[PDB]
Amino acid sequence: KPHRYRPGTVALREIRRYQKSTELLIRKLPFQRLVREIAQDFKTDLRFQSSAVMALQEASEAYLVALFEDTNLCAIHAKRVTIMPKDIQLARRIRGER
Amino acid sequence: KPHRYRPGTVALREIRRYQKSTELLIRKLPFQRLVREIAQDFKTDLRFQSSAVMALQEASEAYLVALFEDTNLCAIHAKRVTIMPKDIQLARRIRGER
Amino acid sequence: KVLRDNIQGITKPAIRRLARRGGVKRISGLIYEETRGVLKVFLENVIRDAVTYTEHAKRKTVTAMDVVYALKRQGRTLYGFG
Amino acid sequence: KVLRDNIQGITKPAIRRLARRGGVKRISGLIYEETRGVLKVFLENVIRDAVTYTEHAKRKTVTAMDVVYALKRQGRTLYGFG
Amino acid sequence: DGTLDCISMALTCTFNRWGTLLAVGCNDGRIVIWDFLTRGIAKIISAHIHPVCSLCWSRDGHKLVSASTDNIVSQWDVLSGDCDQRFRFPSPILKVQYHPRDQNKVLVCPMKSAPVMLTLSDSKHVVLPVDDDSDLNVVASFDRRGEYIYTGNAKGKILVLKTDSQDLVASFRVTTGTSNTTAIKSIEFARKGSCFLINTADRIIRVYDGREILTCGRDGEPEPMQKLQDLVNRTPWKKCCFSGDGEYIVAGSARQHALYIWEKSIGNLVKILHGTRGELLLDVAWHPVRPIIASISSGVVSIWAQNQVENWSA
Amino acid sequence: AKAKTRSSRAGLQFPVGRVHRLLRKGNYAERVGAGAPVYLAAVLEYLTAEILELAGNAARDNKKTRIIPRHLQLAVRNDEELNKLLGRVTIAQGGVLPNIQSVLLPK
Amino acid sequence: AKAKTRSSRAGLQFPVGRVHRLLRKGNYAERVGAGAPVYLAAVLEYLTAEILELAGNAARDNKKTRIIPRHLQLAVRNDEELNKLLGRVTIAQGGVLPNIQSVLLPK
Amino acid sequence: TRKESYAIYVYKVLKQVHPDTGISSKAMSIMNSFVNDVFERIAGEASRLAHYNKRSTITSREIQTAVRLLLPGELAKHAVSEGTKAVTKYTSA
Amino acid sequence: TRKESYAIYVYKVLKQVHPDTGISSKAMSIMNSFVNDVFERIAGEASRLAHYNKRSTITSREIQTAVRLLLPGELAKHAVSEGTKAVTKYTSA
DNA sequence: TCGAGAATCCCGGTGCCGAGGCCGCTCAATTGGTCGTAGACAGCTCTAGCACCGCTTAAACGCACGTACGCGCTGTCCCCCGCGTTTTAACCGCCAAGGGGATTACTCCCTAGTCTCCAGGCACGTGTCAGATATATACATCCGAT
DNA sequence: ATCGGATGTATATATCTGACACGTGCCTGGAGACTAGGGAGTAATCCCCTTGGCGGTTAAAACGCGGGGGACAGCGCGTACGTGCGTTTAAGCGGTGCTAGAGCTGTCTACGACCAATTGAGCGGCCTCGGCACCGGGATTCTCGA
């Protein structure tokens, strides 16, 4: 008889754990390659200080945390518990990102 | 047989008219007395340049227009057409006013 | 010559016309006075900074430039007056 | 040694862990790649300004100070690096 | 749009010069040469008892080559059904391929060894070289003109050698978007010109033109004429090849049992023939002169008829 | 001793001498370059031309000769890049451009 | 004649002379007042004292001595005035204060 | 007291863009305030950049970087083209 | 290269308020950058205010007004208190 | 609704590298003077703000009332959570080359600073016409009877 | 879906102005000319940090696999809110009136600028040790079918 938690319970536990934790939730090398690929739009052979790259990545990560925060807020305001792309677009619209 | 428009139609017409118009939608002297009464919190016998007072009033009016804008946005997102105080509080929360 | 309790200087039809400008169709009553608070709150920021500038200017009245600077330092800069 | 098409460097479980940090319980699939765009969009601002600073510095790489200044001029200042 | 229930235990499928005969290397080690026109058996040759991992038709549509899991490579004829040749070598073979312009040289790709071109006339064979020296999983294929051999290693490095001298006429390590390396799944060609394709393990079919490949030579930076993949499901394709006319290209999604046909010039997806979800797709090929697609799923052959607008409106 | 204003030397309509004096006495740097005020007056002139073009366009559209603040608001809101420049700026007598949301329409 | 730093005379720990040099080289005025750097060092010392006191309290609550960025972020978010001062600021390794909405709780 | 402004220059550029049209006093004040605001933005960005490069001489390159930072996209492109043209015309005196 | 910072002073203040409490170099750098940012903001506001009054000498009054502007409420109150106390202590000698 | 079971708290032990105390070694802070000037202060002006009157009237308060939209409940159903397996490529540790970053030493071309001169800009009048206001009209639009 | 009707809105014309275009005299800030100095540009070198690559591990991403539960649509309802009609209120104009305080000018002084002479606070660099990261395990605590 295999045991399975009800949906959301594991999600809530992971939420608590990650709110308690502090490390980066994005893999280093993929994000670094992404930053290089995007910077290719402005000049080639552009190097980066590693610390600068993780600083950028963590600032953008915190911005993503904040964005998910207000999307969650508008979602719980809409009497829903599942975020939807319209909610993200609404959050970015209220923040003045479009 | 008296005639009466359906609800909202007169509201939509007034919306169009006011979006077309430009004058201040707040009476001058009440707002001026309100500004004096509120400034009483910092120093008495404080005078004000009339132009400065209407500048403040119109800036705050435009801020109110903007606020009603995002409250309308969150309302139409909530599948509703009537703004509610929770929606204003949500808008001010997303804007970072609390 | 002392003023007080004129927060009702803003009226329900005034707020309603303002919301109409904001494109609002239907409004609940509990909004109106609520909005008032918000408005008042807003002033308690800029108004304060306003007099503060005059406080540094050693003057006794407020100029347009004062409220412009107050709105500017609050990320809500305004044009038309300097 | 040329990079391209690595926008999928951000993965669905990574975005999901990030949302969990943001306290999100349930997420729709149409969010994930959507979020990607947003993220990319964000970079196209700061990244740009970043190189611009280096562009003025007549250098060829990016320093931490550069991205700090870029985030600062965008109202998203960051501490820990100067 | 069809199937072949008379054919069972199927493992591979190949088309002759006219594509009218489908060779099916069965699970019990037999080769069913099934005729397309009569929709029936043209020949059955009980080759061995080991499942045939790959077959390959002759240029004149007369000879055939079987590669059983007994480490046995053999050559047979369509009419006599006699074992013209049989040999055993370790490192079981994944791909055998006749010389498109010669009836003596045949490419054979072993698991733990570099590809070897064996002569059908005598006991002579040429072992193809290796760049990274540690492939241990290498593919290779003759060019359409029968003048070159493309060899793909397990790290994206490709060596184009001459089919006779095996000298380095071109070389290039392809990127993977993320600038990493990827084991080459297959290197296949078309019947027209020199436009060919490489299916990789990082789910990107690269439609290249061998003219620029031969032009770049050493340390070239060749970019494909087209890029093909499934952006929405990210399916690693078990086998990919051109259509009958070559303007279109079919890929066999084995994980979800489907076929995906794109174009070549613009490369836009022509359509998707998604078979029955139950079975597991293994092989795929296109009739070289007919709009027919012969697939093989879980060991049974399925047919796909891209019938034109007639036969119901005329 | 041939008199000639620097604005004419740059062929512009903005006072290069005035902006140079302002950059000097505005405490932005210990020293100010020679061509920096020219360049700054040039970019200011370009921005003013860009905004006034749409301003006069809206004014003529409304059959008004003298441009009014409402026309300035319409100009800065209709443009994308200009609105992005003034994203957090309000205008005296500006108002808001005519904008009615989709669902708000009657049905 | 011996020399004592102004911070010693002002009874302060932050370098008054360094703040004076920064103000001079910062192009904020033609000449900085005498007591202005003293006042600035004082207010900076007070702010640092407040934030470090809150951070150390959080660290002692977490049964640790070394103040890590998590403690700093938690202390910043655990004060209304400090938050409003740094609401537009992102702290390294900060994360978010443990917070879960109401409806997200099961029943 | 001669409280200066930019009114005459805005009037001139308006006449050179649209001679028939005019402008009210309030709109002229809005234009003056906007000019002052954008110019102060550019000056602040130039000062910050000069401090970041530890240079005490704000030159044309600093203004180029500042305008490329502030104005978005095509506005920045046209602005830097106009500025380069103007500075080249001036230096060629 | 001698890189000026505030690490020793943050350490002293920490030891004052918290004797037996440690601090990480990362958190120390965050605190240093925070001091730098607060100082930049205060100096900028004071300079703008002084320029708005057509003055040219940033003095204690300017810094006090700038602190009253930037910090909200009781933070600004205790800040102006501490600043006035330090000014008194320094001017007494 | 009480155990079963899985995830967390905590206790103790191991080992490490960052935090911290300490050391020469600057150079930036301090101290003492001299100079030129920023503004504190006094004093005079006028004007713009403040305050009351009265007058007309558009606008606000309140009511009645239909009515339609928020809200609450049902039911379905997709779809995303949950957890197993299977893949991979992130990571980490290490080694390599060099390439731009950073510094230092010259060198001067550029700019601050000063005095001279006049000329564009600005305060201030002065006609004057673009637009703000009223009126009658003509048309576009919502809405109920059919 | 349609037509008659009421209502509201766009238009032309009158016409009336007051803000606006501009013409003027005068001021002073900007252009000319010249001199000093030294921030910035150039070059040459040293080197740290970057990019690059390879191999082993596995934590993690990918895929799939049930299944329960929130999203959503529909339905009913009733309460709150638009809407029109009144009655009532201060809002707005403008008008005069007083003068408190902006706002300007003129000092004259105390206050940094600045330069030079002096040197310990502070900082790169160096050991060094223990708080903390990691871990093994065992108790502890939340959850899910009875």
JSON list of C-alpha atoms in Angstrom, two decimals, chain D residues 27-79:
[
{"chain": "D", "resi": 27, "resn": "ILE", "atom": "CA", "xyz": [1.23, 26.76, -11.29]},
{"chain": "D", "resi": 28, "resn": "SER", "atom": "CA", "xyz": [-0.07, 26.34, -14.84]},
{"chain": "D", "resi": 29, "resn": "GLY", "atom": "CA", "xyz": [2.28, 25.12, -17.55]},
{"chain": "D", "resi": 30, "resn": "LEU", "atom": "CA", "xyz": [1.67, 28.17, -19.77]},
{"chain": "D", "resi": 31, "resn": "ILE", "atom": "CA", "xyz": [3.46, 30.17, -17.06]},
{"chain": "D", "resi": 32, "resn": "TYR", "atom": "CA", "xyz": [6.90, 28.63, -17.43]},
{"chain": "D", "resi": 33, "resn": "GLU", "atom": "CA", "xyz": [8.11, 29.72, -20.86]},
{"chain": "D", "resi": 34, "resn": "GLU", "atom": "CA", "xyz": [6.04, 32.87, -20.36]},
{"chain": "D", "resi": 35, "resn": "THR", "atom": "CA", "xyz": [8.14, 33.63, -17.28]},
{"chain": "D", "resi": 36, "resn": "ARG", "atom": "CA", "xyz": [11.23, 33.00, -19.40]},
{"chain": "D", "resi": 37, "resn": "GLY", "atom": "CA", "xyz": [10.28, 35.86, -21.72]},
{"chain": "D", "resi": 38, "resn": "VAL", "atom": "CA", "xyz": [9.75, 38.17, -18.76]},
{"chain": "D", "resi": 39, "resn": "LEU", "atom": "CA", "xyz": [13.16, 37.22, -17.37]},
{"chain": "D", "resi": 40, "resn": "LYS", "atom": "CA", "xyz": [14.78, 37.75, -20.77]},
{"chain": "D", "resi": 41, "resn": "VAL", "atom": "CA", "xyz": [12.97, 41.08, -21.12]},
{"chain": "D", "resi": 42, "resn": "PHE", "atom": "CA", "xyz": [14.35, 42.15, -17.75]},
{"chain": "D", "resi": 43, "resn": "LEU", "atom": "CA", "xyz": [17.91, 41.43, -18.83]},
{"chain": "D", "resi": 44, "resn": "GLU", "atom": "CA", "xyz": [17.51, 43.39, -22.08]},
{"chain": "D", "resi": 45, "resn": "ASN", "atom": "CA", "xyz": [17.23, 46.42, -19.85]},
{"chain": "D", "resi": 46, "resn": "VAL", "atom": "CA", "xyz": [19.97, 45.96, -17.27]},
{"chain": "D", "resi": 47, "resn": "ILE", "atom": "CA", "xyz": [22.32, 43.94, -19.48]},
{"chain": "D", "resi": 48, "resn": "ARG", "atom": "CA", "xyz": [22.12, 46.74, -22.04]},
{"chain": "D", "resi": 49, "resn": "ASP", "atom": "CA", "xyz": [22.94, 49.45, -19.52]},
{"chain": "D", "resi": 50, "resn": "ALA", "atom": "CA", "xyz": [25.68, 47.19, -18.15]},
{"chain": "D", "resi": 51, "resn": "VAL", "atom": "CA", "xyz": [27.61, 47.05, -21.41]},
{"chain": "D", "resi": 52, "resn": "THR", "atom": "CA", "xyz": [26.86, 50.74, -21.94]},
{"chain": "D", "resi": 53, "resn": "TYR", "atom": "CA", "xyz": [28.83, 51.56, -18.80]},
{"chain": "D", "resi": 54, "resn": "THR", "atom": "CA", "xyz": [31.66, 49.34, -20.02]},
{"chain": "D", "resi": 55, "resn": "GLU", "atom": "CA", "xyz": [31.15, 51.01, -23.40]},
{"chain": "D", "resi": 56, "resn": "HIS", "atom": "CA", "xyz": [32.02, 54.29, -21.71]},
{"chain": "D", "resi": 57, "resn": "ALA", "atom": "CA", "xyz": [34.81, 52.64, -19.71]},
{"chain": "D", "resi": 58, "resn": "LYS", "atom": "CA", "xyz": [36.50, 51.66, -23.01]},
{"chain": "D", "resi": 59, "resn": "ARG", "atom": "CA", "xyz": [36.97, 48.20, -21.47]},
{"chain": "D", "resi": 60, "resn": "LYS", "atom": "CA", "xyz": [35.91, 44.80, -22.84]},
{"chain": "D", "resi": 61, "resn": "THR", "atom": "CA", "xyz": [34.43, 42.97, -19.82]},
{"chain": "D", "resi": 62, "resn": "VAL", "atom": "CA", "xyz": [31.80, 43.77, -17.19]},
{"chain": "D", "resi": 63, "resn": "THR", "atom": "CA", "xyz": [32.50, 44.47, -13.51]},
{"chain": "D", "resi": 64, "resn": "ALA", "atom": "CA", "xyz": [30.16, 44.02, -10.56]},
{"chain": "D", "resi": 65, "resn": "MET", "atom": "CA", "xyz": [30.00, 47.80, -10.19]},
{"chain": "D", "resi": 66, "resn": "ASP", "atom": "CA", "xyz": [28.60, 48.01, -13.73]},
{"chain": "D", "resi": 67, "resn": "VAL", "atom": "CA", "xyz": [25.57, 45.81, -13.08]},
{"chain": "D", "resi": 68, "resn": "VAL", "atom": "CA", "xyz": [25.08, 47.46, -9.68]},
{"chain": "D", "resi": 69, "resn": "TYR", "atom": "CA", "xyz": [24.88, 50.88, -11.36]},
{"chain": "D", "resi": 70, "resn": "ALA", "atom": "CA", "xyz": [22.58, 49.48, -14.05]},
{"chain": "D", "resi": 71, "resn": "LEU", "atom": "CA", "xyz": [20.18, 48.13, -11.43]},
{"chain": "D", "resi": 72, "resn": "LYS", "atom": "CA", "xyz": [20.48, 51.40, -9.50]},
{"chain": "D", "resi": 73, "resn": "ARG", "atom": "CA", "xyz": [19.44, 53.61, -12.42]},
{"chain": "D", "resi": 74, "resn": "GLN", "atom": "CA", "xyz": [16.45, 51.27, -12.86]},
{"chain": "D", "resi": 75, "resn": "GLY", "atom": "CA", "xyz": [15.19, 51.77, -9.30]},
{"chain": "D", "resi": 76, "resn": "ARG", "atom": "CA", "xyz": [16.28, 48.24, -8.36]},
{"chain": "D", "resi": 77, "resn": "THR", "atom": "CA", "xyz": [19.52, 48.96, -6.51]},
{"chain": "D", "resi": 78, "resn": "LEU", "atom": "CA", "xyz": [21.38, 45.99, -5.03]},
{"chain": "D", "resi": 79, "resn": "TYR", "atom": "CA", "xyz": [23.73, 45.76, -2.06]}
]
